[PDB]
Amino acid sequence: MASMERFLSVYDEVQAFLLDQLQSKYEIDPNRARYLRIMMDTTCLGGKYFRGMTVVNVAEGFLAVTQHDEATKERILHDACVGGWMIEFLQAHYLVEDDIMDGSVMRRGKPCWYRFPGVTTQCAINDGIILKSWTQIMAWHYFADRPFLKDLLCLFQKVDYATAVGQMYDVTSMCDSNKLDPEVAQPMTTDFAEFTPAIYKRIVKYKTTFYTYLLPLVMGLLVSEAAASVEMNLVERVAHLIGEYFQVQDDVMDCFTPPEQLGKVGTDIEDAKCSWLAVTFLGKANAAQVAEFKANYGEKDPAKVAVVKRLYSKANLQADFAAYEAEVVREVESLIEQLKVKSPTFAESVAVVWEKTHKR
Amino acid sequence: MASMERFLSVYDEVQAFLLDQLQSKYEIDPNRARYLRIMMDTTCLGGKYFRGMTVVNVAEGFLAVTQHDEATKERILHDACVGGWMIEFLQAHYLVEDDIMDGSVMRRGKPCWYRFPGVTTQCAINDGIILKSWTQIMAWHYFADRPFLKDLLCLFQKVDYATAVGQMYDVTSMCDSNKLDPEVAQPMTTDFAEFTPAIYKRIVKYKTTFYTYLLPLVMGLLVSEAAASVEMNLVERVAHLIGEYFQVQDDVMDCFTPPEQLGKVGTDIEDAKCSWLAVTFLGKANAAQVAEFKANYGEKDPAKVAVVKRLYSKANLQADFAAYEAEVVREVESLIEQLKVKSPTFAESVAVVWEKTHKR
Ligand SMILES: CC(=O)NCC1(c2ccccc2)CCOCC1
Ligand SMILES: CC(=O)NCC1(c2ccccc2)CCOCC1
Ligand SMILES: [Zn+2]
Ligand SMILES: [Zn+2]
Ligand SMILES: [Zn+2]
Ligand SMILES: [Zn+2]
């Protein structure tokens, strides 16, 4: 059976489980079950399933080189699909809550969930809570007797927590650290002293790379009982590397990809985000360029947003991007090699992850 | 050592752990650590610690009747304090997120967290996420080697999920079920057909009673390795009973307790909540009273809120309350007796929980 159709079929299975349990154990009524069904579909479906399918791909790699009974291959593939959905539902939690946090309008060409007329923020914050709760109910039901249950739960736990901390670094990235204070309304930085490569790197490492690249790779290893085929420090290294590259691309598209292709209107400039563009610009600007950027960044006024786009265009940031790209291609290819030693399969799965990132 | 000072000391210990880990493992800087410290204190401290201290009380009960080395009594009491904080931090998550959901202003006489000038909703939704995340980091660190880790995690999981589902029943309690629809903006009910005792009971059972009464009692049993001293169906029964009574009292105070004593301005009438008062009123009103209530409920206009308070005052709902009270006192005393058989200690702890509820 093809991997994607397996994955999709398991979504239907998990959804039926979750809603049937709500009816048998949690006293839900049919209309609320239907609300939750629609919420799950709307928030979990319609992407490429990169994260979830990476767990399945990693597990298919090890199945090709490991001896098992057919029924055991099916159990492993079923566990990889459930684990993959746990990651998709965790991503759905963070996208629902982020969208509300940031006052986002669209995502992928459709309204953010909280904007649906019969949802509202009051319901959508708790719908997002529920999405994450569902990842735990999946794991305790499907993996109850599994040897990897504890490891999987503990890993998922740490990744969730890293992601929340990274949301904390992201939402505070335009403030001066020494001024953070719950008592005092937060001004936007004026010096931009914290728009540096290492600070940027910390934001992206925690906000994105743990759930998007580390978790899928590691969950694939866990459902396969294959953590001995890797040096886990290397898998963490490659995950954070590839995932930083991913975000650098998202930062560039927020500014430069037309909103119909982007699936939303990018507001990183108005939101004064610490993007790769801002940091890279400041790393090469002269005194007058720095002044013009300070006078214009983090302002809704479209004339001022156009002055920042203008400054970036004229700064040749394409060249710094090609150079970054080159260096990542170099370091990922090195880490692939290091992974090839203990596991060719796993190294190939990493290679595929890299190809799907580097191409898009 | 006195229980409360033990409990409080463990808060300092856990907080230092959590923030020190953020510095050693999650690359946090001092200013963000301080933000999180203040957020933890503000959101977790200043209540009566009923929930957390109930875990400690239950564990002290069993220590009096069970043979142990002193070092084992200290480990049990330390585990009961950590478990108690897990419940306090879980409550803190739900109060932060609820407050944002409901557009609340104050709680306990102080501004809701999201209203602090240097917080904002954008940060506060993720601060609430973090609060819950912290309950998992506590459990995996402090209870890593414990025989009860799996049971405790699985119980906490189910209780969290029940609470989220109960938030779903609460926020939708003024809508007609058959009209729930993410696509369509939700009208307030006009018939009030769903303001019934069993529907009310479902809302309160899930929103409050699992985390406030079941979890503390059960967590006390788990850290004590004492689940064999109870019939768990009875402990669930008594928890939901006592916790319904609790909420009936909160529903009556929302309407009738002056805001300086209440610690907030009650808006259940304007919010069209399915409160005990509304349900009990509708259960005894004549045709003209029902019409006047429909014409006035769920409206911000203070004149219309005063007409509902008026209708409730004249309906003698005090009498229905005394009758409810009587019947709960009766059924709790029966369940205490049933618990006394397998465990006098545990039955006494339940008795104390009941006294602290029934008195307040
Ligand atoms: C510095 C750094 O890389 N921290 C991430 C840690 C991690 C690893 C893997 C998944 C989630 C969290 C934090 C907890 O301890 C292990 C490292
Ligand atoms: C009908 C009812 O009481 N449901 C609550 C359940 C529960 C029990 C204890 C803690 C959390 C959840 C739901 C899951 O299965 C067990 C019953
Ligand atoms: Zn965001
Ligand atoms: Zn972006
Ligand atoms: Zn609420
Ligand atoms: Zn209330």
| Alpha helices (H) in A26-109, listed in sequence order | 30-44, 50-63, 70-101
Instruction: Return the structure tokens found at A232.
Output: 């886990």
- Contact between A177 and B31 using a beta-carbon 8 Å cutoff: yes
Q: Which of B325, B315, B318, B346 is nearest to B246 (CA)?
A: B325
Method by which the coordinates were obtained: X-ray
**Residue of A165, A205, A210 to mutate, ligand 1, most atoms within 8 A of C-beta:** A210
Q: Is A236 annotated as a binding residue?
A: yes
Chain B residue closest in CA terms to A157: B136
Question: Measuring CA to CA, how many Å separate A96 from each of A121, A156, A160, B113, B157?
Answer: 10, 19, 15, 21, 21
| Chain A interface includes B164 (CB < 8 A) | yes
Task: List the 40-59 stretch of A: residues with Cβ below 8 A of B.
Answer: 42
| Chain A interface includes B199 (CB < 8 A) | no
Q: Which of B360, B351, B349, B355 is nearest to B56 (CA)?
A: B349
How far apart are alpha carbons B255 and B281 in whole angstroms?
13
Domain at A69, CATH number? 1.10.600.10
3-state helix, strand, coil in chain B (%, to 5): 75, 0, 25
- Contact between B183 and A97 using a beta-carbon 8 Å cutoff: no
Give the DSSP H/E element, type plus range, for residue A27. Answer: none
Contact A55, A135 (CB under 8 A): no
How far apart are alpha carbons B104 and B157 in whole angstroms?
27
Instruction: Return the structure tokens found at B223.
Output: 């850290």
Range of the domain at B144: 1-360
CA dihedral B286, B289, B295, B297 (to 10 degrees): -100
Q: What's the resolution in A?
A: 1.4
| Chain B interface includes A117 (CB < 8 A) | yes
Using CA of residue B171, residue B176, residue B182, residue B184, what is the dihedral sign?
negative
How far apart are alpha carbons A72 and A77 in whole angstroms?
9
Give the nearest partner residue to A184 out of B117, B172, B183, using CB atoms: B117
Question: A-B interface: how many C-beta pairs under 8 angstroms?
Answer: 165
Instruction: For residue A356, report the distance from its CA to the centre of ligand 3, in Å.
Output: 24
Give the DSSP H/E element, type plus range, for residue B272. Answer: none
Contact B33, B19 (CB under 8 A): yes
**Closest approach of chain B CAs to the CA of A287, in angstroms?**
29
Q: Is B41 annotated as a binding residue?
A: no
Q: What phi and psi, each to the nearest 5 degrees, are found at residue B271?
A: -80, -5
| Residues β-bridged to residue A358 | none
Long-range contacts of B185-189 (CB under 8 A, 24+ apart): B185/A117, B185/A118, B186/A118, B186/A120, B188/B272, B188/B298, B189/B272
Q: What phi and psi, each to the nearest 5 degrees, are found at residue A31?
A: -70, -35
Contact A100, A124 (CB under 8 A): yes
How many domains does chain B divide into?
1
Question: Measuring CA to CA, how many Å separate B252 from each of A50, B189, B238, B243?
Answer: 51, 22, 21, 14
**Closest approach of chain B CAs to the CA of A177, in angstroms?**
6
Q: Is the CB of B25 under 6 A from ligand 1?
A: yes
Give the nearest partner residue to B117 out of A27, A185, A202, using CB atoms: A185
Give the nearest partner residue to B133 out of A125, A126, A164, using CB atoms: A164
